[PDB]
Design a protein around this ligand. Structure first.
Ligand SMILES: NC[C@@H]1O[C@H](O[C@H]2[C@@H](O)[C@H](O[C@@H]3[C@@H](O)[C@H](N)C[C@H](N)[C@H]3O[C@H]3O[C@H](CN)[C@@H](O)[C@H](O)[C@H]3N)O[C@@H]2CO)[C@H](N)[C@@H](O)[C@@H]1O
Ligand SMILES: Nc1nc2c(ncn2[C@@H]2O[C@H](COP(=O)(O)OP(=O)(O)NP(=O)(O)O)[C@@H](O)[C@H]2O)c(=O)[nH]1
Ligand SMILES: [Mg+2]
Ligand SMILES: [Mg+2]
Length: 295
């Protein structure tokens, strides 16, 4: 804790000429990024060159702060340093409380409705943007999967068990037959889970964070976690109601999209291990396949 902080404090003061760090703590971290709360006021997201990166995420905040009309707050980048080896983004902390299942379950039916409407409204407004000015930020999930499958075949596929091969081939057979990638494309948050949603003191949606995976992609993408059944998310009904409020979207296909992405998760986990040379992820993903096969 103590050492990571000193180094990042040094980097921040070094790259941002007249920035003075009076206080700094770790507020979150991914597997290859670390985020810091600085002076109790600024968030600094940092990364040391991975498979990235923060350049796109920055272009997206910039695009959205220009074009979104909404009361919902999102990061607004005041500081950035972007290089092959290091990336830093700084912005003012959005104040509020993160949505969780526990909190949601204490809200009145009406409070829940208003939150749902708030979310549907935000997504409607974002998905409706003319994305010409950010048109290079496209993402083809189907193609990505096909490329990832090829990487598997080039690396470890022949060393997998039959059970693991059957799981993978069965998924690919499903990927080939589905129609859920042939629909509307638009700008999506693309990691729209409740740990990125902030509430104000009335339990209304006040902010949204981490547009780091955002891009022009299937409209169905932004409902993947809203429809998820798990300890981390609220539940399938929450996503269903939001889809109804959002309107003009095939709910059964959104679910199919979500179900396919869930099926893919162990393979994605394996592929991450291969790409980043981390055996731990290769083994986790393979083990998850056995757990899914025996449910
Ligand atoms: N940090 C990875 C970033 O997000 C995605 O990957 C993540 C995504 O697939 C999946 O993680 C997603 C998050 O993401 C999302 N924001 C919350 C959601 N509950 C979680 O869900 C996943 O993990 C849950 C528990 N743990 C499981 O219960 C759930 O079944 C599973 N789909 O697993 C990956 C790591 O958890 C992108 N594919 C990747 O390109 C990008 O770099
Ligand atoms: N309250 C608050 N927390 C924030 C804000 N910005 C980031 N965070 C916190 O910092 C954590 C990490 O920020 P996030 O953008 O999700 O980055 P990440 O997923 O960890 N990194 P990456 O997007 O590169 O995979 C979030 O879970 C949340 O705790 C903000 O504006 N307000
Ligand atoms: Mg995040
Ligand atoms: Mg992120």
């Amino acid at each position: 804790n103590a050492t990571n902080v000193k180094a990042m404090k040094y980097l921040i003061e070094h790259y941002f000429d007249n920035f003075k760090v009076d206080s700094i703590e770790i507020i979150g971290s991914g597997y290859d990024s670390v985020a810091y709360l600085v002076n109790n006021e600024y968030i600094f997201k940092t990364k040391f060159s991975t498979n990235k990166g923060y350049a796109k995420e920055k272009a997206i905040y910039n695009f959205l702060n220009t074009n979104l009309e909404t009361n919902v707050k999102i990061p607004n980048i005041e500081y950035s340093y972007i290089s092959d080896e290091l990336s830093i983004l700084g912005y003012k902390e959005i104040k509020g409380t993160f949505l969780t299942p526990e909190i949601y379950s204490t809200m009145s039916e009406e409070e829940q409705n208003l939150l749902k409407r708030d979310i549907a409204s935000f997504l409607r407004q974002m998905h409706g943007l003319d994305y010409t000015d950010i048109s290079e930020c496209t993402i083809d999930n189907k193609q990505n999967v096909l490329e990832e499958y090829i990487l598997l075949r080039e690396t470890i596929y022949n060393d997998l068990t039959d059970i693991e091969k059957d799981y993978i081939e069965s998924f690919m057979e499903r990927l080939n037959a589905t129609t859920v990638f042939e629909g509307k494309k638009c700008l999506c948050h693309n990691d729209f889970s409740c740990n990125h949603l902030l509430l104000d003191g009335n339990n209304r949606l006040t902010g949204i964070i981490d547009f780091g995976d955002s891009g022009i992609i299937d409209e169905y993408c932004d409902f993947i976690y809203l429809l998820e059944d798990s300890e981390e998310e609220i539940g399938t009904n929450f996503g269903e109601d939001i889809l109804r409020m959002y309107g003009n979207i095939d709910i059964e296909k959104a679910k199919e999209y979500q179900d396919i992405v869930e099926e893919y998760y162990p393979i994605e986990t394996i592929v991450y291990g291969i790409k980043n040379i981390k055996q731990e992820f290769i083994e986790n993903g393979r083990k998850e396949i056995y757990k899914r096969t025996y449910k």
